[PDB]
Write a protein that binds this ligand. Structure first.
Ligand SMILES: CCCCCCCCCCCCCCCCCC(=O)OC[C@H](COP(=O)([O-])OCC[N+](C)(C)C)OC(=O)CCCCCCCCCCCCCCCCC
Ligand SMILES: CCCCCCCCCCCCCCCCCC(=O)OC[C@H](COP(=O)([O-])OCC[N+](C)(C)C)OC(=O)CCCCCCCCCCCCCCCCC
Ligand SMILES: CCCCCCCCCCCCCCCCCC(=O)OC[C@H](COP(=O)(O)OCCN)OC(=O)CCCCCCCCCCCCCCCCC
Ligand SMILES: NC(=O)C1=CN([C@@H]2O[C@H](COP(=O)(O)OP(=O)(O)OC[C@H]3O[C@@H](n4cnc5c(N)ncnc54)[C@H](OP(=O)(O)O)[C@@H]3O)[C@@H](O)[C@H]2O)C=CC1
Ligand code: SF4
Ligand code: SF4
Ligand code: SF4
Ligand SMILES: [Zn+2]
Lengths: 178, 144, 156, 94, 207, 342, 114
């Protein structure tokens, strides 16, 4: 189906009343006072702005920001150098290099993320079969240099040791959906 | 009348931060006098007030510390200083603060949160976590 | 009281001025420009902080590189940065401009705006939330707050 | 495991500390290298060994869908103890 | 009834096969290999001398009112000597159906332009030239669109490397944006992913 | 030879050379070109800076990731210099001023600071040290700057031998203080010249040449106890050189003589300035003494640079000063300067 | 062997167009040195023109020469107009790129490549 937007039915009805009405639409700027009153109405509304550093916009548990490598409650490192997070990372941001830990365990000697290549897509955290790397909540890590946004294993483990109280809870909310 | 009620509310806002000293300490430092219920304080000194009658971007707010880890944050306020215990609550990921619903304690989680470090020392310098892959021949210390 | 103290206070004053009235440029190339708009939107109003767009670069104190920078658009960006009058700052927004982003390995992309213009602050994301770019702007304010220019003039 | 080297730098769980002749120590001047104090070797060694009754068992991480894929460990040997591959939890039977 | 797999029609297949017979027997001088895919799509393949007559036919015939060009593409296939498989995606708006017309080319075997039929094809032909190097006869402008101005190469060919041959950066010595030979801080990690097991015996290339 | 200072790559950005260098006058005019020519081939460049971070931004680029390390310092304070040269192979002194200050004199710029830097370099154990004196640097000269620079050239040898001492002529470049300095004499409606410019000879050199020279000398197995004269070709007489400047900058030319004593007093009262002065007594003195015939010394071509004539690169410098009606004028419409040999 | 033409019967009819193109470039160079404030001389610009012509002087197929004439006419369009800039025009000179050595021993001293 369809319907017209700027099609009158037809013409050929005019009277002195309608002519006076159109002539007072003209000559008084009638349809402009309406917009003026609209903007005036907006002057007397509670604005939608927020004091940002103090009061902040709402986010969700699914929100994906900074990255972090997690541990088990034993403090054991949770990644296992399976290297599919780099296989799927569509920006090739992840380089991994691994070895036996001298305990005989599968672990990484390397986990870097160029955060100027990551598109923050979450494929890595939904592919990691142990929930080792996640995409944390943080969005306030702007830096004064490019080199700071080239992460390594230590920075990711520090992000994990930092935001685990928030990461674990958001995961607690968000599983059963994945 | 109505004007009188709103002016009474304004007076309550004006006289609800201690005195003139605290009123100015809040107004020139957050640009808002709005009163809320103190939900809970931090181990650094942040306050985390609340008032649910406001709309869904101003019903929770922080009043930051004046000194976090030796930085003198009376004016240099930033959003990284909110630890993860309160990040979830402030960004409205929950209706459950850490006063009632605290997080699981673990032996590896940081006890002292850190503000954002990008210009100071104590920042992040990258490097290769790996080792020398090829080993060069160490010649003898003797002739012939 | 002392000349060095007077100079420190004058530095504080001029830094406060340049920090409170920074006029970015209507320079938005790709998706990240939409979050820049949303930071111009009512929730995170930039004008609250004294931050208003000027479409001309000569009336601009900062540029926000919000989008992907190609080999074809880099001369224009550099001409515009030059045309900006000092003191001038740059803010790289998004993984496309900080580095290469999702197009780092492609043939018509410069792998970082930092190859062409100097960058004071890098805002990461794809896109960054407008709160994140606002954090970057306030970080630039914190950066201007500690210039100590007249101090080094006195100490030369 | 945050022993230092004779140069004075910290050492990672990947023995990585730059040599005294390496020019790449400049990047840590007026700065610091991020190195994590909580090592996984020490912290998984600071755990008991889970006595069990059977000879085959099953280890998830502990949360079900939050741990690792459910594997099974044999415990017939007594010269040593079983060990999970994903986690490092050890097991034995009496 | 099978919820996981896609439902199939019959009438559209029969319709488009009949219309393929129509075009074949009505335009034989130019036509090769008419075909209809599993999913309902007609696909005609054409000698490059037939581009203008076939496109004018499908635009202006009464039973074929294909008077809207959707795409004009190309596909570089270095195996076949005539590499570029140029494609035209057209719709009707009178019968609510689409059709595909194909012809071949090479670096030195250009094709008649189509702006006399669809004005939409101006920028598309400019794009095909910019990307593959297929010259187009009697085209008004035929200059690049997407690539840089002083660009040497046709990128979307398979024989062109992804990272390119030049790279840009601003030099203080000359105060310009100079082009330098490519040098990456990190090589693109190509991955070999094709499994060595035949998943589709229907497309089993025999020896 | 550590495995990390082994050169790799096709000689460009994102490569390695083994040229870890501390460049002390990097925030200036020659140092920016030096840092550019270093980063252009791949090399870590430690850059000590005392200025504000606004004036290190143009150096923040011109190098791949991690290859540009800035750290703050102070000539008064040792341990801000050992900290810089602690990990380096090469050190390049470009420090210098065209005027004294209350805090720093010419001695405390050309003599005591290179001595400290070279002490730190020898104690750290670096391989090279590139000092930059002036061509006219002589203990029996007229200027405080030139005598101080000869004294520094001697004391640097006395402390750190196995050194390289480059002695350029008056350099010209886009943001120099030689061609721009002579072209800014239009704001005064006539230009003064001692003896009308005659009995004075100038053999200027371009920045790119000196930069490539330094950047090759930090890799040449020669040049360990060698002084150099980075002069450039086409010795020029000052009157004809200023005439070429005021022809390429198409404004006008009203020369007239002036003694040295009144022009010295002019330079003095101009140097009465808390800001960057326009003119100084030592600048006038350095302008009105001729450049030595440099053919007792190697120069550029013994180091791997073919010197560039002024006539080919001057328009890049001087088109800034032109007006409309002349900005769109080419190099071949200025009847070039008259060369001399003497 | 019995292939189709494009704008050419054979090589002389194409060298005609090649000389026309050289003509247009020679007439155009002084206008571009003036419009966009290039810092070079008209002599070396025309030398670069002749150089970039001689880079393809080893060819005999008329179709190659015709496509090269087409590409050169495109470049001449972009250069007659000021669609492109001092950057793209000075990109031919290689003013920053160090000269690739053509001697065996220097290649041996830096790099494993021939
Ligand atoms: C010239 C005549 C003076 C013109 C008025 C200048 C007023 C400056 C001022 O009020 O400082 C505000 C500021 C107030 O603090 P602030 O605005 O910089 O702190 C940031 C506040 N939030 C978190 C809300 C963004 O004072 C200073 O911080 C120091 C700078 C001013 C130094 C003036 C010394 C004289
Ligand atoms: C009331 C509203 C109306 C306001 C209009 C009036 C403005 C009032 C402002 C008063 C403060 C004036 C300070 C201006 C300083 C601006 C220049 C500057 O900061 O550069 C540093 C300058 C330059 O110092 P410098 O010598 O170190 O420069 C370094 C040079 N480079 C960049 C090459 C390394 O220092 C000064 O000159 C400050 C003194 C100026 C006093 C003039 C009177
Ligand atoms: C006693 C017998 C004798 C009595 C003699 C007196 C007889 C009565 C005289 C009535 C005349 C009133 C004057 C009105 C002037 C407007 C004329 C007019 O027709 O409008 C002009 C313009 C028309 O626009 P358009 O839609 O194109 O129609 C033209 C069709 N050809 O439309 C416009 O003007 C729009 C452009 C202007 C928009 C500007 C926004 C103004 C917003 C309103 C501001 C109101 C506040 C004014 C406060 C001023 C107080 C100092
Ligand atoms: N025309 C020329 O430029 C010629 C120069 N030379 C020699 O070339 C060298 C450099 O020339 P140029 O590049 O023009 O010098 P510039 O004046 O251009 O910059 C020199 C550097 O010296 C630093 N500097 C000056 N005084 C001090 C100080 N007291 N303490 C610490 N740092 C200081 C400055 O740092 P900041 O600016 O941050 O203070 C600046 O980066 C000098 O040694 C000079 O003798 C010789 C012949 C010609
Ligand atoms: S979020 Fe996406 S782009 Fe970012 S690291 Fe993970 S997989 Fe790569
Ligand atoms: S982070 Fe996860 S997906 Fe990536 S290598 Fe480690 S275990 Fe595998
Ligand atoms: S970083 Fe992401 S959001 Fe920003 S411009 Fe690039 S693709 Fe768009
Ligand atoms: Zn387990």
């Amino acid at each position: 189906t369809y319907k017209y937007v700027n099609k009158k039915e037809q013409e050929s009805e005019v009277d002195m009343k309608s002519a006076t009405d159109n002539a007072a639409r003209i000559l008084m700027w009638t349809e402009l006072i309406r917009g003026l009153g609209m903007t005036l109405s907006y002057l007397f509304r509670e604005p939608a702005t927020i004091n940002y550093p103090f009061e902040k916009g709402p986010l969700s548990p699914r929100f994906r920001g900074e990255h972090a490598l997690r541990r088990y409650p034993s403090g054991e490192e949770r990644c296992i150098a399976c290297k599919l997070c780099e296989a799927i990372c569509p920006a090739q941001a992840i380089t991994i290099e691994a070895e036996p830990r001298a305990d005989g365990s599968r672990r990484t000697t390397r986990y870097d993320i160029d955060m100027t290549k990551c598109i923050y897509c979450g494929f890595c955290q939904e592919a990691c079969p142990v929930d080792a790397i996640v995409e944390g909540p943080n969005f306030e890590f702007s830096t004064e240099t490019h080199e700071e946004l080239l992460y390594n294993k230590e920075k990711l483990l520090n992000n994990g040791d930092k935001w685990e109280a928030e990461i674990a809870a958001n995961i607690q909310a968000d599983y059963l959906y994945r | 009348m109505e004007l009188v009620e709103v002016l009474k509310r304004g007076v309550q806002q004006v006289t609800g931060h201690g005195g003139l000293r605290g009123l100015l300490r809040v107004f020139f430092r957050a640009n808002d006098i709005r009163i809320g219920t103190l939900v809970g304080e931090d181990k650094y000194g942040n306050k985390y007030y609340e008032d649910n009658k406001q709309f869904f971007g101003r019903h929770r707010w922080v009043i930051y510390t004046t000194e976090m880890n030796g930085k003198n944050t009376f004016w240099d306020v930033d959003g990284s200083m909110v630890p993860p215990e309160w990040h979830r609550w402030l960004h409205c990921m929950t209706d459950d603060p850490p006063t009632t619903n605290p997080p699981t304690a673990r032996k590896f989680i940081w006890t002292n949160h850190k503000f954002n470090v990008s210009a100071t020392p104590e920042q992040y310098v990258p490097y290769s976590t790996t080792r020398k892959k090829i080993h060069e021949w160490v010649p003898p210390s003797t002739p012939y | 009281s002392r000349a060095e103290y007077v100079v420190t206070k004058l530095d504080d004053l001029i830094n406060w001025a340049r920090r409170s009235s920074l006029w970015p440029m209507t320079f938005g190339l790709a998706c990240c420009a939409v979050e820049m708009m949303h930071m111009a939107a009512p929730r995170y109003d930039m004008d609250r902080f004294g931050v208003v767009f000027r479409a001309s670069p000569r009336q601009a104190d900062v540029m926000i590189v919000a989008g992907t920078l190609t080999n074809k658009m880099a001369p224009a960006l550099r001409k515009v940065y030059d045309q900006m009058p000092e003191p001038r700052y740059v803010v790289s927004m998004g993984s496309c401009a900080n580095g290469g982003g999702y197009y780092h390995y492609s043939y018509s992309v410069v792998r970082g705006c930092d190859r062409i213009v100097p960058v004071d602050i890098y805002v990461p994301g794809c896109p960054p939330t407008a709160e994140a770019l606002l954090y970057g702007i306030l970080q630039l304010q914190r950066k201007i707050k500690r210039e100590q220019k007249l101090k080094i003039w006195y100490r030369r | 495991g945050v022993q230092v080297s004779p140069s004075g730098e910290k050492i990672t769980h990947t023995g990585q500390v730059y040599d005294e002749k390496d020019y790449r120590r400049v990047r840590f001047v007026d700065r610091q290298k991020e190195v994590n104090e909580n090592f996984a070797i020490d912290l998984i060694a600071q755990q008991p060994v889970n006595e069990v009754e059977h000879r085959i068992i099953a280890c998830d991480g502990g949360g079900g869908a939050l741990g690792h894929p459910k594997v099974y460990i044999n415990l017939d040997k007594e010269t040593k103890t079983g060990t999970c591959g994903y986690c490092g939890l050890q097991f034995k039977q009496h | 009834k099978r919820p996981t797999v896609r439902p199939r029609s019959d009438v559209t297949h029969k319709q488009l096969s009949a219309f393929g017979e129509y075009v074949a027997e009505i335009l034989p001088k130019y036509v090769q290999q008419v075909q209809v895919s599993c999913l309902d799509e007609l696909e005609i393949c054409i000698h490059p001398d037939g581009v203008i007559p076939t496109l004018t036919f499908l635009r202006d015939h009464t039973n074929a009112q294909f008077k809207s060009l959707a795409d004009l593409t190309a596909v570089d296939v270095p195996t076949r000597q005539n590499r570029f498989e140029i494609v035209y995606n057209l719709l009707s708006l009178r019968f609510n159906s689409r059709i595909r017309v194909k012809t071949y080319a090479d670096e030195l075997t250009p094709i008649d332009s189509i702006v006399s039929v669809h004005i939409a094809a101006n920028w598309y032909e400019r794009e095909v030239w910019d990307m593959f190097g297929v010259f187009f006869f009697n085209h008004p402008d035929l200059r690049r669109i997407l690539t840089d101005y002083g660009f040497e190469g046709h990128p979307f060919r398979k024989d062109f490397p992804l990272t390119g041959y030049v790279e840009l950066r601003y030099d203080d010595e000359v105060k310009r944006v100079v082009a330098e030979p490519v040098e990456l801080a990190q090589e693109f990690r190509k991955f070999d992913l094709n499994s060595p097991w035949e998943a589709f015996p229907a497309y089993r290339q025999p020896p | 030879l550590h495995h990390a200072v082994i050169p790799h790559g096709k000689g460009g950005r994102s490569s390695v050379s083994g040229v870890v260098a501390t460049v002390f006058g990097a925030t200036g005019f020659l140092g920016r070109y030096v840092v550019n020519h270093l980063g252009r081939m791949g090399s870590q460049v430690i850059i000590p800076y005392r200025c504000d971070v606004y004036d290190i931004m143009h150096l923040r680029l011109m190098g791949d990731l991690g290859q540009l390390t800035f750290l703050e310092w102070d000539a008064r304070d040792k341990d801000s210099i050992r900290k810089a040269v602690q990990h380096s192979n090469v050190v390049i002194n470009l420090i210098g001023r065209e005027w004294e200050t209350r805090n720093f004199d010419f001695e405390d710029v050309f003599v005591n600071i290179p001595r400290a830097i070279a002490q730190a370099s020898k104690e750290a154990g670096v391989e090279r040290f590139i000092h930059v004196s002036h061509l006219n640097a002589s203990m029996k000269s007229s200027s405080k700057s030139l005598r101080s620079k000869a004294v520094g050239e001697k004391e640097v040898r006395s402390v750190f031998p196995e050194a390289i001492i480059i002695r350029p002529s008056d350099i010209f470049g886009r943001e120099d203080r030689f061609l721009n300095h002579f072209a800014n004499y239009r704001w005064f409606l006539a230009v003064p010249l001692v003896s009308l410019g005659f009995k004075t000879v100038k053999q200027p050199v371009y920045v790119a040449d000196v930069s490539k020279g330094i950047v090759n000398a930090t890799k040449d197995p020669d040049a360990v106890g060698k002084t150099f004269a980075f002069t450039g070709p086409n010795r020029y007489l000052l009157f004809h050189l200023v005439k070429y400047i005021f022809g390429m900058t198409h404004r006008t030319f009203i020369p007239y003589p002036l003694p040295l004593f009144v022009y010295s007093w002019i330079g003095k009262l101009f140097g009465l300035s808390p800001f960057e002065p326009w003119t100084t007594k030592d600048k006038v003195e350095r302008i009105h003494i001729s450049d030595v015939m440099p053919t007792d010394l190697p120069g550029l071509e013994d180091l791997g640079v073919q010197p560039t004539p002024l006539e080919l690169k001057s328009i890049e410098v001087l088109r800034r000063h032109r007006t409309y009606r002349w900005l769109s004028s080419e190099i071949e419409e200025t009847k070039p300067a008259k060369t001399v040999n003497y | 062997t019995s292939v189709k033409p494009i704008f050419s019967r054979d090589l002389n009819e194409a060298k005609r167009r090649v000389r026309e193109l050289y003509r247009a470039w020679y007439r155009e160079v002084p206008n571009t040195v003036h419009l966009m404030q290039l810092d070079i001389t008209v002599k070396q610009g025309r030398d670069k023109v002749r150089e970039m012509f001689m880079k393809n002087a080893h060819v005999t197929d008329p179709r190659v020469v015709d496509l090269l004439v087409i590409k050169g006419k495109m470049e001449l369009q972009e250069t007659i107009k000021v669609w492109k800039q001092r950057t793209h025009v000075m990109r031919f000179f290689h003013e920053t790129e160090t000269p690739r050595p053509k001697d065996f021993l220097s290649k041996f001293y830096m790099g494993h490549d021939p």
